[PDB]
Amino acid sequence: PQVADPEVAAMVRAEVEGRWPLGVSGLDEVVRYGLVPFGKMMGPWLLIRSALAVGGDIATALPAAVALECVQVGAMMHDDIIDCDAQRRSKPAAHTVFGEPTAIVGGDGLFFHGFAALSECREAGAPAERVAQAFTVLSRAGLRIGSAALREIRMSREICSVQDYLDMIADKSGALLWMACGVGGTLGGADEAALKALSQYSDQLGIAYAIRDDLMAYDNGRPTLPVLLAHERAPREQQLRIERLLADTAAPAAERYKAMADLVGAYDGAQAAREVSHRHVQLATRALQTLPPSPHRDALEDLTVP
Amino acid sequence: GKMMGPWLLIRSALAVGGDIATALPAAVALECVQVGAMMHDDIIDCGEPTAIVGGDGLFFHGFAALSECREAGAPAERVAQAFTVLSRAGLRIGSAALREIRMSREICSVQDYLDMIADKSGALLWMACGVGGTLGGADEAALKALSQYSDQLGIAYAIRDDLMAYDNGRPTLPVLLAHERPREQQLRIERLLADTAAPAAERYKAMADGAQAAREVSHRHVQLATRALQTLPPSPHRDALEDLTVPGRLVLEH
Numbered sequence: 032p033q034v035a036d037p038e039v040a041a042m043v044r045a046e047v048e049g050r051w052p053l054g055v056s057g058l059d060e061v062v063r064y065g066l067v068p069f070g071k072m073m074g075p076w077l078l079i080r081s082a083l084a085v086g087g088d089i090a091t092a093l094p095a096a097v098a099l100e101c102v103q104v105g106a107m108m109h110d111d112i113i114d115c116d117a118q119r120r121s122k123p124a125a126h127t128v129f130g131e132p133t134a135i136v137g138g139d140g141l142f143f144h145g146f147a148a149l150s151e152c153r154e155a156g157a158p159a160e161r162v163a164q165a166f167t168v169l170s171r172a173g174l175r176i177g178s179a180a181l182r183e184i185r186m187s188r189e190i191c192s193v194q195d196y197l198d199m200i201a202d203k204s205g206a207l208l209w210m211a212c213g214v215g216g217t218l219g220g221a222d223e224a225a226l227k228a229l230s231q232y233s234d235q236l237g238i239a240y241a242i243r244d245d246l247m248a249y250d251n252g253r254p255t256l257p258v259l260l261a262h263e264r265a266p267r268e269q270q271l272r273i274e275r276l277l278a279d280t281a282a283p284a285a286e287r288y289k290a291m292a293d294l295v296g297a298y299d300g301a302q303a304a305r306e307v308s309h310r311h312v313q314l315a316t317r318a319l320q321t322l323p324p325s326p327h328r329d330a331l332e333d334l335t336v337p
Numbered sequence: 338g339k340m341m342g343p344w345l346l347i348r349s350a351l352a353v354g355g356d357i358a359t360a361l362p363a364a365v366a367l368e369c370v371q372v373g374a375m376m377h378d379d380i381i382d383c384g385e386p387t388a389i390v391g392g393d394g395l396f397f398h399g400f401a402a403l404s405e406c407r408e409a410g411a412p413a414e415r416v417a418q419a420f421t422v423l424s425r426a427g428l429r430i431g432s433a434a435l436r437e438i439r440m441s442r443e444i445c446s447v448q449d450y451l452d453m454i455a456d457k458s459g460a461l462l463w464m465a466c467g468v469g470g471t472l473g474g475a476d477e478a479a480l481k482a483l484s485q486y487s488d489q490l491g492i493a494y495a496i497r498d499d500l501m502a503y504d505n506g507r508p509t510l511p512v513l514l515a516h517e518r519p520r521e522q523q524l525r526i527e528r529l530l531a532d533t534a535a536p537a538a539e540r541y542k543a544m545a546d547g548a549q550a551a552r553e554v555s556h557r558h559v560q561l562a563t564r565a566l567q568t569l570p571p572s573p574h575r576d577a578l579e580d581l582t583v584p585g586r587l588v589l590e591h
């Protein structure tokens with residue numbers, strides 16, 4: 032290869048740890064609680080690779096990667112307030128620890144640390160025209176995620192078309208990926224064709240990740256793709272009860288759950304979901320081939336492979 | 338009546354030689370941030386799910402539309418600085434709001450109270466002045482004037498909100514300024530809001546029984562707010578900014 036290959040996920044952690052280190056107080060303490068433990072940090076990792084994949088600078092993509100981390104943690108800290116399915120492995124919710132008002136302010140401080148970190152990209156050398164278009168990309172993507180999250184709450188206990196669900200999770204998971212790739216590609220100086228490719232890669236990989244989440248239950252009241260594909264195939268009589276249990280509000284969820292795995296298994300909803308997920312992974316790798324060959328494009332391609 | 342920020346942003350932009358076609362989409366953008374911020378304020382004061390996410394969405398709308406000022410013809414170098422100004426203002430408010438939740442049931446220092454409302458109310462106005470002035474092409478001296486003006490105007494109106502209750506129970510400047518001026522009445526002031534089991538309508542009358550001092554503090558900041566305007570060049574927009582200093586006839590409700 033002609034370009035280098037850094038260790039992205041470890042570099043971002045050093046930058047976030049530097050900005051909000053151990054021992055912070057005030058609002059920084061609530062910001063740090065949301066950030067740590069760090070974990071994979073795939074969002075920021077995706078932005079830097081997307082920036083470097085088109086010729087960008089690490090120094091320009093780095094503050095935007097912190098911005099990506101802050102916005103994602105801000106959205107997670109607020110989503111924990113309105114949604115409550117506490118997996119016994121889930122990190123204790125910030126509202127459980129600090130109280131609901133502090134989780135509200137804390138998530139907002141994370142959002143504005145994001146905007147402030149993205150504002151620093153100008154100081155890092157990016158042209159002012161690029162920083163503003165990055166904010167436009169960042170802002171529009173966040174609006175897609177927000178709109179999808181609300182329809183996710185509203186569409187619970189209801190059966191929807193399979194295509195509506197795909198459009199649903201694309202605006203939540205795909206926009207979450209596009210926000211990293213679109214801002215990374217923008218600051219890297221990508222032309223319109225590369226940004227469209229990174230947009231296609233984001234949408235297609237985002238569908239795959241969303242389906243993968245539906246599958247770990249089978250490998251809430253939320254409609255999932257295996258149930259939806261199973262409903263599509265089941266004859267009329269099984270379709271009604273599939274609808275009536277999800278519509279049901281006063282029947283044990285544990286029995287509705289196991290009475291749902293029976294329908295998904297009977298009509299191969301789980302396997303049908305993998306093939307749909309497989310179809311979109313192939314479209315994601317296809318989209319990447321537009322980008323110039325590099326280790327960064329290789330890193331983005333490997334990410335599709337489970 | 339309405340929020341000072343939209344009007345305050347436009348006058349700030351035009352007072353430094355700015356364009357109206359730039360300030361108009363920006364003030365719309367500025368409203369989105371403030372309106373979204375208030376949606377979250379209604380939750381810390383106690384539908385909540387739609388209010389949380391919809392409040393978040395208005396922040397993104399504010400920055401999207403602030404970037405949209407490139408469509409209005411604004412120099413991208415000014416818009417870039419507007420992002421920096423707006424972002425640091427939200428950080429000041431968030432730190433101030435956090436201190437507020439952690440100030441209840443406790444008498445604080447006056448200087449600690451002024452900085453809180455300065456970082457809360459002043460930065461909220463600075464969120465309007467600073468963004469507006471930036472998109473108007475102000476130099477560093479004008480932006481300084483707008484900073485001190487917004488901080489001093491925010492304090493003054495924050496006190497006026499404190500007075501309106503006397504003519505809830507979180508400490509206000511009159512309660513504090515009354516405390517600082519005997520030892521026994523220092524205790525009496527502290528216990529009642531710390532107190533958790535008592536009639537609210539009575540601790541209200543018992544607390545009323547410093548407010549005039551709050552007006553002198555408020556007046557001192559109105560002068561500082563007006564002095565900061567002198568750093569700006571004389572114009573109708575600067576005169577309109579002096580008009581807002583005198584209380585006038587506003588809503589005066591939350």
Ligand SMILES: CC(C)=CCC/C(C)=C\CC/C(C)=C\CSP(=O)(O)OP(=O)(O)O
Pocket residue numbers: 136139140374375377378427428430431432434457458461495498590591
């Ligand atoms: C992180 C962030 C951006 C904001 C956190 C704080 C929130 C949610 C709202 C603050 C509202 C402001 C800035 C001023 C109204 S004080 P007032 O006395 O005029 O009226 P009020 O107290 O709002 O009734």
Ligand SMILES: [Mg+2]
Pocket residue numbers: 378379382
């Ligand atoms: Mg309030």
